[PDB]
Amino acid sequence: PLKVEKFATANRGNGLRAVTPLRPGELLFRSDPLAYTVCKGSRGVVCDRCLLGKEKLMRCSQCRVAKYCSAKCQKKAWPDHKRECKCLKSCKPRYPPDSVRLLGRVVFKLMDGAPSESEKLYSFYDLESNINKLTEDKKEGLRQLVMTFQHFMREEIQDASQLPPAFDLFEAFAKVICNSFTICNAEMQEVGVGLYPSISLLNHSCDPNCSIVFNGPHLLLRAVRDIEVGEELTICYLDMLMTSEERRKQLRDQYCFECDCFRCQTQDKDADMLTGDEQVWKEVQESLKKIEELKAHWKWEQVLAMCQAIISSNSERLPDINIYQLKVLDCAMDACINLGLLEEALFYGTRTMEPYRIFFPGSHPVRGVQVMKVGKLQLHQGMFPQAMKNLRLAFDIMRVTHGREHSLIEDLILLLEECDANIRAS
Ligand SMILES: O=C(NC1CCN(S(=O)(=O)C[C@H]2CC[C@H](NCCCC(F)(F)F)CC2)CC1)c1cc(C2CC2)on1
Ligand SMILES: Nc1ncnc2c1ncn2[C@@H]1O[C@H](CSCC[C@H](N)C(=O)O)[C@@H](O)[C@H]1O
Ligand SMILES: [Mg+2]
Ligand SMILES: [Mg+2]
Ligand SMILES: [Zn+2]
Ligand SMILES: [Zn+2]
Ligand SMILES: [Zn+2]
Numbered sequence: 001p002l003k004v005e006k007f008a009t010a011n012r013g014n015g016l017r018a019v020t021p022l023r024p025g026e027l028l029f030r031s032d033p034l035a036y037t038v039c040k041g042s043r044g045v046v047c048d049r050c051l052l053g054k055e056k057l058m059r060c061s062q063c064r065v066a067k068y069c070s071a072k073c074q075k076k077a078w079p080d081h082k083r084e085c086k087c088l089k090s091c092k093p094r095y096p097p098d099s100v101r102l103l104g105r106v107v108f109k110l111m112d113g114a115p116s117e118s119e120k121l122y123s124f125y126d127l128e129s130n131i132n133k134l135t136e137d138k139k140e141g142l143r144q145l146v147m148t149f150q151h152f153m154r155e156e157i158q159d160a161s162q163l164p165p166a167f168d169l170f171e172a173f174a175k176v177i178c179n180s181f182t183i184c185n186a187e188m189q190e191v192g193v194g195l196y197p198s199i200s201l202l203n204h205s206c207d208p209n210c211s212i213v214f215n216g217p218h219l220l221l222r223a224v225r226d227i228e229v230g231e232e233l234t235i236c237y238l239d240m241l242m243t244s245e246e247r248r249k250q251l252r253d254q255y256c257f258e259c260d261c262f263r264c265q266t267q268d269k270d271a272d273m274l275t276g277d278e279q280v281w282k283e284v285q286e287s288l289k290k291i292e293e294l295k296a297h298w299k300w301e302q303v304l305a306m307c308q309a310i311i312s313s314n315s316e317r318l319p320d321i322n323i324y325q326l327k328v329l330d331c332a333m334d335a336c337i338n339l340g341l342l343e344e345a346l347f348y349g350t351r352t353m354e355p356y357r358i359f360f361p362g363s364h365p366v367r368g369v370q371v372m373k374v375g376k377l378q379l380h381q382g383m384f385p386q387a388m389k390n391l392r393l394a395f396d397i398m399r400v401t402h403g404r405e406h407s408l409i410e411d412l413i414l415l416l417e418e419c420d421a422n423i424r425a426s
Pocket of ligand 4: 130
């Protein structure tokens, strides 16, 4: 018995609404992807199948592009990799855009696979394309993706009889652009891109009543507020650390809509997000383009070097509540954790705690993860009362956003028991 149902909204296309009253933390839907792939930066760093990082990965011998954590993952991935393998090998050394590799997997799944549970409420065929809202520049970009797909897939798909009935590649890429999900690992690093057509029914809010979280490729949809019968379910499509102007640009560019929510009408939190000297944070925002690229490719030493030059600059500095400063602290923290620089990681992480309380109101999985990271760093440094407070706060958030079905909650329970045993021996 589903707790959610598809419906036709008055002015947002189709949507999802509650069939029963919902409480924070309630699991509403869970889904594997219709199709997914590792993303550009994480290719060869994480396993193609389970999206977990490993010090050494085994490569597919035929294409040498797909890489796996284990013989189990390589073999289990073979049915969904078999046809793309010949295309990837034929295209070497050229690697396709993520969207092109993704749509290849969509096509093979729809041609060769049984009907997917991911499409229970809504299918790839049903997805919004927004084609009549596309500007000419966007249509041109989609045409180039179509031609890139035809080149990449030529070994496996030569004509329309090898595509699903009435399949239009331009329309398919339009759907991919507006309906791709960024798959994040347990630490909230972007590691993949996938299509989850039933989850695509969720419309956007900058102050949503639901949240999604990834456990490998698996997606969990949970309520994060009380929700009444008939009430529309929403998620936030975007990073919370964005001004209303930034959200406006991305929602127009990628999703072809103008957001009418209260936060956008009132520029909610914009002024607090942009405190400090504008010339300074404009420079930091510029530097973050490279920092974000380095982080996406797991280049932690390079990330840390650039972040330290900002955090410890000889020149003017920013308040930690400035969102570009905050992003630099976040990246520096994550780099230090991955490099084993645990004292420095804790310094940066502790500084983010109050800004995160302000910018992630309610129960948000990203703040849950951040607080867990800080609590774990404090546990390792022997600060048991401080660690316990943060681990308990992380649990209060993550019991709602992640839940028992997410493996990170089991990890958190072990940290809480270890911290508690230390306190009791003191
Ligand atoms: O992919 C979808 N949403 C995303 C929203 C964002 N999250 S997140 O949980 O906040 C994790 C993010 C936290 C920030 C992190 N970036 C930090 C970079 C900072 C810099 F630049 F300084 F380096 C990246 C991960 C993931 C899911 C989606 C699609 C749809 C379709 C339209 C239906 O809905 N939702
Ligand atoms: N808050 C919002 N206001 C207006 N349109 C929205 C919206 N959130 C999502 N959408 C629409 O939904 C698309 C994302 S997919 C969400 C389901 C979609 N409404 C459908 O009918 O299939 C966006 O590109 C936009 O067309
Ligand atoms: Mg349509
Ligand atoms: Mg329309
Ligand atoms: Zn694996
Ligand atoms: Zn291969
Ligand atoms: Zn809004």
